[model samples]
Target: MSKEVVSLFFQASHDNDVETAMSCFAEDGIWVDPTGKVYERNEIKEYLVQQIGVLEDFHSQGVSVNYFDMVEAPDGRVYIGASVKAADGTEIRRFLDVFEMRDGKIAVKDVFGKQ
Candidate 1:
């Protein structure tokens, strides 16, 4: 169920559905971006706004996720590793995300990725 929630969050991001993505977070959820910026609680919406813009650009550019893999840790945390591709199928970046769940929602998400 936790992994499902995280998957839905990523799917919402890919679809540029800001509200659904935002709804995946716990009340006091935290997001640590790849650039090391942190967003907590309501501040997460600001980050999501920026992310939506990026997703929109990706859509216009014909970029998409190449692959997304996820696994649950023994401790119940979830890890997602994925890669993105450009319109011409050029590699864009690889992403690694760690999620901690609370009350069936995401309590924390630490994002990492490389170009």
Candidate 2:
């Protein structure tokens, strides 16, 4: 069940459908980027929308689940690795995203990416 949720979230992201992607999160879900900026659900949605504007023919591929490690915390977090490719194929950014789920919805997410 947890794996399914994480997979769906990534699929939505790849599709660039911010509404569908954001729907996976809880109302109070938190998103933290590598820069340490924190964003709630609405803020995260806005951020994604902005990213879509900058990336032309953006797509995600080479996605893989690294491992499922359970922390001492009650909410389980899953980590996923993916490659983000640009339209020109000149850029490929590897990303690691951590998702924390609560009540079947994403409660928190942290992402790190590099080219």
Candidate 3:
């Protein structure tokens, strides 16, 4: 399930595949970006549409291998910390995400990125 969640969403983000990235969400999936603003469903899609391009230049440079992690908390919600960094490990975008999963879909994603 971890692999499914990570690959279905994150890999697509890295590859700039918007369609694939959006597919990971449920019909009413929720997204909280780094700013703590919330987006739902189509709003999430719109946000993701801009995501790949926003990260493109940074990604094309040297990034790190420790970008994605699937952490299962005792409360059953999943936490993922994905950080894209310079070759020297200076972070470009460090995302700490918490998810509520239901019926194999990402029902809610509360994400905050480190500045």
Candidate 4:
């Protein structure tokens, strides 16, 4: 189920479906970016908006998920490994996202990534 939830989150992000992506998280969920910037529930929307804005600035039509994998560890957390490419086929970023889940929703997401 954790893997499924991660898949849903990635699929929503790949399609730029902000609402669905947000729904994958708990109401009190926190997202920590690679730079250590924290976006709690409310701020998550803004974070998504800014991400889309960056893609627009780059003239990307949308995102392509190059690779997506999930690992469920004994600590009851899911680790997601993924890479994104612009619709134009340029690899934009690669990341490892650590997720702490509560009741099947994301309680916390910590991201580590590189361009």
Ranked by lDDT, the better of candidates 1 and 3 is 1
Candidate number achieving the greatest lDDT relative to the actual structure: 1
Give per-residue CA lDDT, model 3, range 41-110, as digits (tens).
Answer: 9698778777676666565776654655577766557877777777998766677878887777788888
The lDDT-based order of candidates, best leading, equals 1, 4, 3, 2
Candidate 2, residues 1-115, lDDT tens digits: the string is: 5666777766777687777778788999998987779997668877877765544333244333233343323346776665554444543566677787888888888888674
Clashing pairs in 2: none
> What TM-score fits each model?
0.82, 0.66, 0.75, 0.73
| lDDT of all predictions | 0.85, 0.68, 0.74, 0.81
lDDT of 3: 0.74
* Runs off by more than 4 Å, candidate 4: 53-65, 83-93
lDDT, residue 81, model 3: 74
lDDT of 3 at 44: 84
Name the runs in model 1 displaced over 4 angstroms.
14-17
TM-score of 4: 0.73
